[PDB]
Amino acid sequence: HMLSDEQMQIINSLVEAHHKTYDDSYSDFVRFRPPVRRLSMLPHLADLVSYSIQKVIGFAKMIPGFRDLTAEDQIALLKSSAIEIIMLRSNQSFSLEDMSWSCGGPDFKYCINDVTKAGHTLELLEPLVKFQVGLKKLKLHEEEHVLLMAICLLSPDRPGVQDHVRIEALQDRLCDVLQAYIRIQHPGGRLLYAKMIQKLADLRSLNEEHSKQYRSLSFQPEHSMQLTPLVLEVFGSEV
């Protein structure tokens, strides 16, 4: 029922890592290919996701213990969860009043129809929006928000992971910090921690649905050429 110095240091370093890799001004968005409203939004949203993958990579390397892993394990965890971290971190721009992602002006405001113009269907987008609303209604502290992202990235049960025991120990170290934070900051505690873990289960099925739809898009040359090299590396099937 109290945080040790190193538990607090893990929290401090994770929120600082998030502040350095998430620019609330979204001023870099003007360098993306312009939004346009056959898949007129795919160029802009591909640049958005590709840019966000860079930010996720930057955040990952500031997670205590992550850089101590093998380069292969670092990439295996990043490839398997990048889309989940993006969906998690996107909740900061999601607004329940408009049910949209607002990153500044209306040009960079993304509703669900904009994503239909990137090659995705409601079998993914409607569960994604429902996930965003449920995540928004939990009203997480930013400390709980960044701990959840770190916990999602350090999941040992990802394909291609070799040093499993090392990754699970770091994940448990973060879950213990998160559980203690909730217990101190909130009445009770076990209920909220349970739903945060459930949100990670929701992200697994969202990933599954996105990977299916991405594979269909990436195998059509007219759409695949609108992607970016980093997106093809990260979301692709290569090894």
Partner: peptide
């Protein structure tokens, strides 16, 4: 391809 993913130094 993991040519770019080799900026994991």
């Amino acid at each position: 391809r993991h040519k770019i993913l080799x900026x994991x130094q």
